[PDB]
Amino acid sequence: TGAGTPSQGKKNTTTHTKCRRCGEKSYHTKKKVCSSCGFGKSAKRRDYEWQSKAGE
Amino acid sequence: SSGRFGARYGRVSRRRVAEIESEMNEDHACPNCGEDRVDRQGTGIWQCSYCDYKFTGGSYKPETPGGKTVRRS
Amino acid sequence: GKKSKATKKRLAKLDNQNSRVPAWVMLKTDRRNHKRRHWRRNDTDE
Amino acid sequence: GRRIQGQRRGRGTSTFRAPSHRYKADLEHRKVEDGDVIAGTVVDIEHDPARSAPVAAVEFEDGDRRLILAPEGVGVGDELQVGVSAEIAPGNTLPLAEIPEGVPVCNVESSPGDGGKFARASGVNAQLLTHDRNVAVVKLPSGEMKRLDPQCRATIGVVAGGGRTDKPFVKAGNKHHKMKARGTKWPNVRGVAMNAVDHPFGGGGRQHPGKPKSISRNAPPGRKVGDIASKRTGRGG
RNA sequence: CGUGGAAGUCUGUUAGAGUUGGUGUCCUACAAUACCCUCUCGUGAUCUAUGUGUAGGGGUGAAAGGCCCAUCGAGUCCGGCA
RNA sequence: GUCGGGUGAGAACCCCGACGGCCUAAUGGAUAAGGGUUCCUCAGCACUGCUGAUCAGCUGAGGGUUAGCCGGUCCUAAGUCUCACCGCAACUCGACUGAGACGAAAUGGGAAACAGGUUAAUAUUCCUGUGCCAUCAUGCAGUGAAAGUUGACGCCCUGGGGUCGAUCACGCCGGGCAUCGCCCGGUCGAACCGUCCAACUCCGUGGAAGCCGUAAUGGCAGGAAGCGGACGAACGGCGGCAUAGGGAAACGUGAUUCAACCUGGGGCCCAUGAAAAGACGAGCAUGAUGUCCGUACCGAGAACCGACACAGGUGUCCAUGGCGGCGAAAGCCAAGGCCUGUCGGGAGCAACCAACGUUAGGGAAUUCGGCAAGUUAGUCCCGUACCUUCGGAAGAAGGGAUGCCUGCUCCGGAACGGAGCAGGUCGCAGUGACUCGGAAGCUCGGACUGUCUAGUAACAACAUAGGUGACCGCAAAUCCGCAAGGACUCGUACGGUCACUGAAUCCUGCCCAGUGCAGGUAUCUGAACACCUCGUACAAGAGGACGAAGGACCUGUCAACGGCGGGGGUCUUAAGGUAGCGUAGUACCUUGCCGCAUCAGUAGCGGCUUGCAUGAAUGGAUUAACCAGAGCUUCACUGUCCCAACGUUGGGCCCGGUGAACUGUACAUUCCAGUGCGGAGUCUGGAGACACCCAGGGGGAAGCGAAGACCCUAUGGAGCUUUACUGCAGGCUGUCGCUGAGGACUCUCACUCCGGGAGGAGGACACCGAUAGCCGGGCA
Ligand SMILES: [Cl-]
Ligand SMILES: [Cl-]
Ligand SMILES: [Cl-]
Ligand SMILES: [Mg+2]
Ligand SMILES: [Mg+2]
Ligand SMILES: [Mg+2]
Ligand SMILES: [Mg+2]
Ligand SMILES: [Mg+2]
Ligand SMILES: [Mg+2]
Ligand SMILES: [Mg+2]
Ligand SMILES: [Mg+2]
Ligand SMILES: [Mg+2]
Ligand SMILES: [Mg+2]
Ligand SMILES: [Mg+2]
Ligand SMILES: [Mg+2]
Ligand SMILES: [Mg+2]
Ligand SMILES: [Mg+2]
Ligand SMILES: [Mg+2]
Ligand SMILES: [Mg+2]
Ligand SMILES: [Mg+2]
Ligand SMILES: [Mg+2]
Ligand SMILES: [Mg+2]
Ligand SMILES: [Mg+2]
Ligand SMILES: [Mg+2]
Ligand SMILES: [Mg+2]
Ligand SMILES: [Mg+2]
Ligand SMILES: [Mg+2]
Ligand SMILES: [Mg+2]
Ligand SMILES: [Mg+2]
Ligand SMILES: [Mg+2]
Ligand SMILES: [Mg+2]
Ligand SMILES: [Mg+2]
Ligand code: NA
Ligand code: NA
Ligand code: NA
Ligand code: NA
Ligand code: NA
Ligand code: NA
Ligand code: NA
Ligand code: NA
Ligand code: NA
Ligand code: NA
Ligand code: NA
Ligand code: NA
Ligand code: NA
Ligand code: NA
Ligand SMILES: [Sr+2]
Ligand SMILES: [Sr+2]
Ligand SMILES: [Sr+2]
Ligand SMILES: [Sr+2]
Ligand SMILES: [Sr+2]
Ligand SMILES: [Sr+2]
Ligand SMILES: [Sr+2]
Ligand SMILES: [Sr+2]
Ligand SMILES: [Sr+2]
Ligand SMILES: [Sr+2]
Ligand SMILES: [Sr+2]
Ligand SMILES: [Sr+2]
Ligand SMILES: [Sr+2]
Ligand SMILES: [Sr+2]
Ligand SMILES: [Sr+2]
Ligand SMILES: [Sr+2]
Ligand SMILES: [Sr+2]
Ligand SMILES: [Sr+2]
Ligand SMILES: [Sr+2]
Ligand SMILES: [Sr+2]
Ligand SMILES: [Sr+2]
Ligand SMILES: [Sr+2]
Ligand SMILES: [Sr+2]
Ligand SMILES: [Sr+2]
Ligand SMILES: [Sr+2]
Ligand SMILES: [Sr+2]
Ligand SMILES: [Sr+2]
Ligand SMILES: [Sr+2]
Ligand SMILES: [Sr+2]
Ligand SMILES: [Sr+2]
Ligand SMILES: [Sr+2]
Ligand SMILES: [Sr+2]
Ligand SMILES: [Sr+2]
Ligand SMILES: [Sr+2]
Ligand SMILES: [Sr+2]
Ligand SMILES: [Sr+2]
């Protein structure tokens, strides 16, 4: 069984769903944690300084 | 009793296991009556088929030379 | 797949977003839907 | 390099842990005040998945159902006594001072009232030797002389399920089935068949260890493989 | 002689799992690993669905430096960075 | 697919019929995940559809998903999260512990629904009939009420009970067939309410000294068979349900084999096979209440994932439709679905290619190699060697048989079950198709089954049982963490940890000099602190005294890393190759020499063997069995070859439609020579050369494809090793603080551990903070 096209058949799982807090399809319903806003992990909002070029 | 091993395994496999299996599927003495009705129930567990005295004993041999030393003192 | 109540409310709106720009908007602006979605070629949320 | 197998062990992941949820009981001793007014009838003899040997289901005087470690001979209907002035019969739990000399005993305690630590495996025993006012010397299954506190409880008799190790596994299937129920990763791939990146004995164009097998006791975790602090090796000579 | 019905036993395109040879077909493919004939295992250290756990110098590894989403002798993204 | 026909401006592919086929664990039925309206109707063809389209999963606008009893909801599972607490510089970080929560839609547990009808599309939801569960209210019952049971459970074998299904018998109802009279379809009817009980256990009676009983095991004077009896099953039977329903009609009765469902007996384990909520325990009447979420369609060679209407991938239930046969096998056929693995037309249809059939004579001569293809083939009977771990080898090998018809015997209760006999008879051929081992022998390796490089390696590599060694008495050894703390461990030496060798069998020699590890050590060496001397109004600073681990040094150890030579009849550096095995997967010389086998044998097997440079758990030797493992020989077979031929299907060629890409400095009809950076269509000289187009096989364009992986270079990168350099974890050790009372000791009061507690063990040590010396590719 090749790692390409045939392994793409077993892909009927739901992981990332529409978040309650921000609304991006980043709420990992198995982890109950958002990968975009960080809902379920932090009380604060997931923002990072590297999401923009250093001097901007 | 190790005839299920076939042409595989070896001599010590069909001498030891076959000996200790023909020895346990046998008739042994019971401490609650005095009859030969002692059968096995698993690993270490021994059972009588009379007044069903479910007792303890050596894994495959009912009475080990170490389990008979408890009687001397 | 079993959908919930909210999931239904959402998929419902997405279907109304699939309606064309009415004939009169063309006559009012004196002459394109960009959120044009197909059930096969496109992907929705969840 | 990479962390060796024994390093991944201590992390305590599923692969290396014991299926605790599938285990029966934490076999300890009963708490009597002082007087020996506790006794119990053995109702059943079950199998312990945690330690292969048989385990006795005992219902006491006050109806406290607890699984106790089973000594040889003891069966359904039999009565055993737990306390200070217990009977010197096989299967009775009492302190070392109250137990006479030259008697094979099991489920020995280290510190008094710990629930038992020593001599527990399939068919083993412990020999009680010296009796002083301060000390009670016990000979543990390995042959070591442990200077124990006479207030330490112990069960009289040898453990049941003896002579188990005397029969071979015959097939890997029998070993697989056993190891699935324990806290061990199986099978055992020799460190020599691995890559240099995976173990200190790994690599090479052929199979052999790099340095000598014997290693210092001061060796760090990741270099402590082979013969750990060997005082010698080999059979004869 | 029979009864019995054991087995990492046996034959088996039973379901299923695997993939030896053709170095066949294909090789701007049906397909970024496919097709066909052959071949192997098929009551067991078996095969499988879903749920769940282990995370990057770290996992996992019946060890091939194998696998960790077409990415592995150290994943991916963005930043350091022009 | 074909001929008709329908709608239409337009029809090969939209629709009707006929004729013809395809699919049978799927190409049918129901669904999970996922999709998300793709379902239904109407109107359309600019888009999408491998051609066309009047069709459509397309475009546009409407419509469509109705539940107390189907899921969800509740329960708890591996396990997850929140709060508290603790750590962290800190957190969205982290382990323990407490408390709460979440965690199962096919497929865990679970209070309760069946039959029919209805729509363009829903349906146990709506409608008709009937029935069932729960809470609560009133009325009656009842004072029990919680002990116990249930929920609730592995694998293998097996009897019993029993429904649907299928088949046999016969009757009735409807159809088919046109020499016979055979063939097909139907003959229905739930839930629920009632009732019956086999198995099992048990009680009374009985009185077996050998009996009772089983498919098997078994059972009994501690009481057998026989007899009566208490408890007690189905998704079963029987009755009701039902002058319900459904059916054009008849609107059956019996039977065998029996899925489901019920209930027993047996065996296996170095494996022991969830939990909880709920129910039961523990009545009945009437009335009421039963909210909320899901409910359309696909579920795949077009509704999912793979960029696509992708030949790929993806779970579950239908495993009992007929013949067949051991069979859920092949082949053929229903029920059902489809002609959408969706472009067509024409040429005896060439060459050439893909699949493939048959080839006279020879028969591996082909080739690295029988690669490819082939041969054998099912069932019965006779028969079966060496060797062997006694299991196997073995279906060895080899030999015979095999249909149809008539009439029968035997096993059994019987089958529409099996085994046999006698006569009759057809063919080239009787497992007539289909299904369906080729056989044997020598050697190597690995014991075996198994594992593996998803995507060029399936193997001798990995693993394994087996053997051995090492460490640890649990406040352990080993391992993770910065810490709080954690894995092993609900574990305790018959244990688990770390390594090595790799079934069995027969053995496994010698060396401890070097490296390693461990122990000891009079003496040497050995850091900082404190102490002593001088120096400083103090500091810096010079010497001394003391001294740990460590090192020196001695001993132990090779199933520990490893070693087993030269010279002469010892030397280095400890010993100086023993059993075996041997020109080996190891031997250079080497196609070693002898032999077997062939016409011929760098091959293969056997023996010899001074072994360039075999050899004992860096395991040595031997081996039955096993193997898509490497090598060789024989029998059989054959288009592999001698040597090629004919044929078959899809292409290929011509016509309609659709309609890409790789590549392109320019010029370019070339060839023979030469020249040139030494490998020119283009320069020089000649020769040749009218233009365009079709098919072809690919000589050339140092053809196209890829800023060579080789090689060197760069003061390039990375992975890896170590007695490279330097450092860090980490271990060991002295010292200072924690830290108390009276170079050896007593105590308890800090601190630690254990006990529920009382209290018990240890004790200024230990833990921790700091510093100092040693070791330190575990890490950078
Ligand atoms: Cl073990
Ligand atoms: Cl549902
Ligand atoms: Cl039975
Ligand atoms: Mg719409
Ligand atoms: Mg390393
Ligand atoms: Mg495990
Ligand atoms: Mg315990
Ligand atoms: Mg191994
Ligand atoms: Mg390797
Ligand atoms: Mg080896
Ligand atoms: Mg080795
Ligand atoms: Mg072949
Ligand atoms: Mg999984
Ligand atoms: Mg490698
Ligand atoms: Mg429908
Ligand atoms: Mg298609
Ligand atoms: Mg011929
Ligand atoms: Mg030749
Ligand atoms: Mg008869
Ligand atoms: Mg093998
Ligand atoms: Mg591969
Ligand atoms: Mg293979
Ligand atoms: Mg071993
Ligand atoms: Mg071992
Ligand atoms: Mg090996
Ligand atoms: Mg040796
Ligand atoms: Mg030779
Ligand atoms: Mg050879
Ligand atoms: Mg290179
Ligand atoms: Mg480098
Ligand atoms: Mg404590
Ligand atoms: Mg390095
Ligand atoms: Na979609
Ligand atoms: Na027999
Ligand atoms: Na293949
Ligand atoms: Na990394
Ligand atoms: Na068409
Ligand atoms: Na009934
Ligand atoms: Na049949
Ligand atoms: Na197998
Ligand atoms: Na040495
Ligand atoms: Na050697
Ligand atoms: Na195999
Ligand atoms: Na041919
Ligand atoms: Na060419
Ligand atoms: Na590298
Ligand atoms: Sr494949
Ligand atoms: Sr899947
Ligand atoms: Sr969190
Ligand atoms: Sr931020
Ligand atoms: Sr898609
Ligand atoms: Sr405890
Ligand atoms: Sr304990
Ligand atoms: Sr090595
Ligand atoms: Sr020796
Ligand atoms: Sr098998
Ligand atoms: Sr097979
Ligand atoms: Sr090849
Ligand atoms: Sr390919
Ligand atoms: Sr072929
Ligand atoms: Sr079978
Ligand atoms: Sr950058
Ligand atoms: Sr048109
Ligand atoms: Sr449709
Ligand atoms: Sr819940
Ligand atoms: Sr369920
Ligand atoms: Sr039956
Ligand atoms: Sr439906
Ligand atoms: Sr379907
Ligand atoms: Sr498919
Ligand atoms: Sr049909
Ligand atoms: Sr088409
Ligand atoms: Sr012919
Ligand atoms: Sr040949
Ligand atoms: Sr030849
Ligand atoms: Sr024959
Ligand atoms: Sr060997
Ligand atoms: Sr694989
Ligand atoms: Sr061996
Ligand atoms: Sr040494
Ligand atoms: Sr010799
Ligand atoms: Sr051509």
PDB file of C-alpha atoms (C1' of nucleotides) in Angstrom, chain B residues 24 38-47 54-64, chain D residues 45-48 52-55 70-74 122-123 159-164, chain F residues 269-272:
ATOM      1  CA  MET B  24      -1.445 -33.309  35.821  1.00  0.00           C
ATOM      2  CA  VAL B  38      -8.120 -33.999  41.727  1.00  0.00           C
ATOM      3  CA  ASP B  39      -8.149 -32.107  38.421  1.00  0.00           C
ATOM      4  CA  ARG B  40      -6.608 -28.780  37.336  1.00  0.00           C
ATOM      5  CA  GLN B  41      -8.466 -25.451  36.900  1.00  0.00           C
ATOM      6  CA  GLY B  42      -5.589 -23.302  35.668  1.00  0.00           C
ATOM      7  CA  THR B  43      -2.212 -21.927  36.725  1.00  0.00           C
ATOM      8  CA  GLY B  44      -1.703 -23.104  40.315  1.00  0.00           C
ATOM      9  CA  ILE B  45      -5.386 -23.806  41.042  1.00  0.00           C
ATOM     10  CA  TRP B  46      -6.369 -27.412  41.826  1.00  0.00           C
ATOM     11  CA  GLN B  47      -9.921 -28.732  42.126  1.00  0.00           C
ATOM     12  CA  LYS B  54     -11.060 -26.112  45.155  1.00  0.00           C
ATOM     13  CA  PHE B  55      -7.556 -25.768  46.575  1.00  0.00           C
ATOM     14  CA  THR B  56      -4.033 -24.492  45.983  1.00  0.00           C
ATOM     15  CA  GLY B  57      -0.912 -26.304  44.838  1.00  0.00           C
ATOM     16  CA  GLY B  58       2.140 -26.305  42.600  1.00  0.00           C
ATOM     17  CA  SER B  59       1.425 -24.911  39.123  1.00  0.00           C
ATOM     18  CA  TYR B  60       1.424 -28.243  37.321  1.00  0.00           C
ATOM     19  CA  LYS B  61       2.317 -30.724  40.126  1.00  0.00           C
ATOM     20  CA  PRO B  62      -0.347 -30.828  42.979  1.00  0.00           C
ATOM     21  CA  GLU B  63       2.181 -31.208  45.816  1.00  0.00           C
ATOM     22  CA  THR B  64       5.666 -29.742  45.372  1.00  0.00           C
TER      23      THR B  64
ATOM     24  CA  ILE D  45      -9.272 -19.498  44.728  1.00  0.00           C
ATOM     25  CA  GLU D  46      -8.894 -17.078  41.763  1.00  0.00           C
ATOM     26  CA  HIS D  47      -6.079 -16.345  39.247  1.00  0.00           C
ATOM     27  CA  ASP D  48      -4.018 -13.135  39.584  1.00  0.00           C
ATOM     28  CA  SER D  52       0.414 -15.537  37.679  1.00  0.00           C
ATOM     29  CA  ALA D  53       0.234 -17.502  40.989  1.00  0.00           C
ATOM     30  CA  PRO D  54      -3.182 -18.219  42.647  1.00  0.00           C
ATOM     31  CA  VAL D  55      -4.983 -15.740  44.885  1.00  0.00           C
ATOM     32  CA  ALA D  70      -2.500 -18.015  48.468  1.00  0.00           C
ATOM     33  CA  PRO D  71      -0.038 -20.490  50.114  1.00  0.00           C
ATOM     34  CA  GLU D  72       0.162 -24.174  49.087  1.00  0.00           C
ATOM     35  CA  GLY D  73      -2.515 -26.639  50.212  1.00  0.00           C
ATOM     36  CA  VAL D  74      -5.109 -24.089  51.452  1.00  0.00           C
ATOM     37  CA  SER D 122       5.106 -18.420  42.541  1.00  0.00           C
ATOM     38  CA  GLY D 123       6.262 -21.057  45.027  1.00  0.00           C
ATOM     39  CA  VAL D 159       3.525 -19.557  48.167  1.00  0.00           C
ATOM     40  CA  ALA D 160       1.275 -21.642  45.890  1.00  0.00           C
ATOM     41  CA  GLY D 161       1.852 -22.211  42.184  1.00  0.00           C
ATOM     42  CA  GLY D 162       5.314 -23.705  42.653  1.00  0.00           C
ATOM     43  CA  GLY D 163       7.542 -25.225  39.978  1.00  0.00           C
ATOM     44  CA  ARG D 164       6.130 -22.951  37.261  1.00  0.00           C
TER      45      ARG D 164
ATOM     46  C1'   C F 269      -4.358 -20.697  29.881  1.00  0.00           C
ATOM     47  C1'   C F 270       3.523 -18.961  32.754  1.00  0.00           C
ATOM     48  C1'   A F 271      -3.261 -15.456  28.486  1.00  0.00           C
ATOM     49  C1'   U F 272      -8.173 -15.891  33.635  1.00  0.00           C
TER      50        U F 272
END
